[PDB]
């Protein structure tokens, strides 16, 4: 380009070529799970009377 644009492109480049900063990204996924089933049940069977 023209020397006037060359000097303009030279500033654009210098700004655009800036050392891009780095990022360390730690994620922390914590899950906790449990629960209580309970099955208690009573059955009575009698020949004479009847059963449940």
């Amino acid at each position: 380009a023209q020397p006037d644009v060359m000097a303009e492109l030279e500033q654009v480049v210098a700004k655009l070529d800036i050392r891009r900063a780095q990022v360390l990204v730690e994620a922390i996924i914590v899950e906790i799970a449990d629960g209580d089933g309970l099955n208690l049940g009573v059955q009575w069977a009698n020949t004479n009377g009847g059963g449940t």
Partner: peptide, 27 residues
């Protein structure tokens, strides 16, 4: 990249966005 589209309306002046340094070059 997203800002380029926004500004393109305002212009529509000559724009591009550098995906790397995430900078906008307008003239």
């Amino acid at each position: 990249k997203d800002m380029v589209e926004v500004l393109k309306g305002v212009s529509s002046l000559a724009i591009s966005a550098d995906e790397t340094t995430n900078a906008l070059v307008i003239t």
